[PDB]
Design a protein around this ligand. Sequence first.
Ligand SMILES: O=C(O)CN(CCN(CC(=O)O)Cc1ccccc1O)Cc1ccccc1
Ligand SMILES: [O-][O-]
Ligand SMILES: [Cl-]
Ligand SMILES: [Cl-]
Ligand SMILES: [Fe+3]
Length: 498
Amino acid sequence: APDEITTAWPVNVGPLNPHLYTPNQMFAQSMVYEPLVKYQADGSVIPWLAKSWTHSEDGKTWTFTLRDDVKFSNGEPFDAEAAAENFRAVLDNRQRHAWLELANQIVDVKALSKTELQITLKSAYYPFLQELALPRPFRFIAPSQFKNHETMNGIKAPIGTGPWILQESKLNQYDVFVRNENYWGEKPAIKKITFNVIPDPTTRAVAFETGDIDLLYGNEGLLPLDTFARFSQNPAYHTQLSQPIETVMLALNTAKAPTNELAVREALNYAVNKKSLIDNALYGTQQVADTLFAPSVPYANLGLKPSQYDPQKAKALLEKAGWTLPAGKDIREKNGQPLRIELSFIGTDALSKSMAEIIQADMRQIGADVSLIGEEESSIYARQRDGRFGMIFHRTWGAPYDPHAFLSSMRVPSHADFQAQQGLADKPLIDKEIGEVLATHDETQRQALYRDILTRLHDEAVYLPISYISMMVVSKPELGNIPYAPIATEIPFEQIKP
Ligand SMILES: O=C(O)CN(CCN(CC(=O)O)Cc1ccccc1O)Cc1ccccc1
Ligand SMILES: [O-][O-]
Ligand SMILES: [Cl-]
Ligand SMILES: [Cl-]
Ligand SMILES: [Fe+3]
């Protein structure tokens, strides 16, 4: 019991196929599967399964020297055959990985020997190693657990080289993990971790208070923020709030009336009292966001001009673009048509509902009629893929995704960001520059390109940045300080030390 912990997650961890997406949970995939190279807090990668690498002048050709002491948790060796088999299994599903540009860059992968793995690329793709460090999909299952020599159609046992092993999984109840006693690296202090399936935020908070669970770790939706604050004050409990990890924002549809109008999007960026929204819906626990990426994100310190909360300026912009108040209605019209904007969100999510109503109230004050469209997850996702939205809640991806991979993704037609940007005349140019920036090794041209991309996106008011949000922890005191993992979607259980 003293080196075993119980914690919670909103759904099961999934089958833990290392190469597929939802319902697999990334943090669980990272507990079982490892990358060639490991991301660090400081933005670099260090050696991991690969102990060294070289790259051609090219540098389109890469040669990794792997550790020779690693075994999958079932005793089978990790070597360059296994690695290459994994990359093949991922790339037989190439289409599915379209959002990750490394998947389109990989041209060939080949085991030169047990300890040498060669990977060759379409281009001198700068973010190569960071993308290899990601939870998915470039991590390694024992080949012997492939189904008919593929992973794309399912796996057998989810055997990784990772510091944790999936002991047991009860659909809709729990998942139990156990420390890998034959890990190649440092042994975790925790021996057993039990994940209780609890989808309701307030039910999570209760399970903590009653003592049923020892740990909660998540983003701003981990538990009600008012309860979180009450906890921070009670010495019976332990709580933490990290520094911001990523951005929460609306995406505005530049291709759909009335948000197709620059002037309208500029006003919207002046209408919301952000600090009050945070103080009112997020119990004062998050930070205001003025730009797509916080100035602390790499390449993102551009001196971009915030739009402060300024109702009067929002009105003026509206009036000048011809969106005026009829007698005696509170909602602007121009040319027949009322200033009506649909804001869609997952309607079961109380926090999203909560922020939307505030957004709705603030924009009413400047003569914008926002109708709330709260729908189930899938509908929201289909609107995202389709561009069937005026405004949609959205969020950046945290490190190491931010900003390169988030920017990379704007190019993919089925993503909310591509759809929002469709109305821009500059859209092809941006997508071209996103492509160039990812292959640039002139370091000054790289800065210049990100500058152009982010600036164009800022000045077009594609987004309405709301908050830079944080990770948060609630824990039994006996567990000690809980660390944060470099990768925002990972959970560093192996650094927990009672
Ligand atoms: O899924 C990933 O590995 C990472 N995701 C890659 C893209 N996703 C692919 C998919 O989910 O199929 C699709 C996706 C698109 C837009 C928003 C979120 C999404 O998951 C990005 C991500 C990073 C951190 C946290 C959440 C999502
Ligand atoms: O992908 O979450
Ligand atoms: Cl070593
Ligand atoms: Cl170059
Ligand atoms: Fe994803």
